[PDB]
Amino acid sequence: KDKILGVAKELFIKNGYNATTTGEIVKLSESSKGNLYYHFKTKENLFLEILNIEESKWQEQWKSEQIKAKTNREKFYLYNELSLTTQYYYPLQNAIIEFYTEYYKTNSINEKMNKLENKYIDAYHVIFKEGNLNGEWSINDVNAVSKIAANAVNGIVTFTEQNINERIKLMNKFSQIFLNGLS
């Protein structure tokens, strides 16, 4: 099972969804097409199980990391920096948008992806709701500002080889510009 997932993960990271064939996963992960079935049934179901795991891993990683930032202003900066460095979730965004746009008509897995989408945004909701409570800023629509922050950041992370220190400088600058736009 774990042999199939990891190879699935990296193949999707490198080549995206469509280009990664079920056979190529079965080829490199030394297992039958019938062994992937029963465990995962279908390639789409395989993909959703990977995203479920990725969100948890990311969520746990952030659960432990946010403790390191006192104020919510710092939690924003820090969260945004981690999204660069992390190995969870953000490296699969290309595949996620590739997968999202095809199967957005099918609601069985659309709903599931909104479920996953809500949690990836909720991190920002808490940060801004908490900032409001502790007088760090004033926001009347935390939901809107959360949606914007997440996707803006996801934009910087996905679209910007590339020097890792330079990406952090750019992200810190974004973080600065955004927070001071609230103030």
Ligand X SMILES: CC[n+]1c(-c2ccccc2)c2cc(N)ccc2c2ccc(N)cc21
Distance CA 98, CA 121 (A): 19
* Torsion over CA: 48, 50, 53, 59 (sign): negative
Interacting residue with a second copy among 49, 117, 122, 130 (CB under 8 A): 117
User: CA-to-CA distance for 161 and 88, rounded, in angstroms?
Assistant: 18
**Per CB under 6 A, which region of 68-76, 114-122, 132-140, 164-172 contacts ligand X?**
114-122
Task: Decide which of ligand X, a second copy, none touches 26; Cβ closer than 5 to 8 Å per partner kind.
Answer: none
Residues whose CB falls within 8 Å of the CB of residue 152, separated by 6 or more in sequence, listed in order = 174, 178
Does 94 participate in binding a second copy (rule CB under 8 A)?
yes
Let me know: does 11 contact 20? Beta carbons within 8 Å.
yes
Q: Residue from 29, 86, 94, 132 that binds ligand X (CB under 6 A)?
A: 86
Neighbours of 41 (CB within 10 A): 11
Q: Which stretch binds a second copy (CB under 8 A): 59-67, 69-77, 128-136, 144-152?
A: 144-152
Which of ligand X, a second copy, none does 144 bind, CB closer than 5 to 8 A by kind? a second copy
Residues that bind ligand X (CB under 6 A): 58, 83, 86-87, 96, 100, 113, 116-117, 120, 150-151, 154, 159
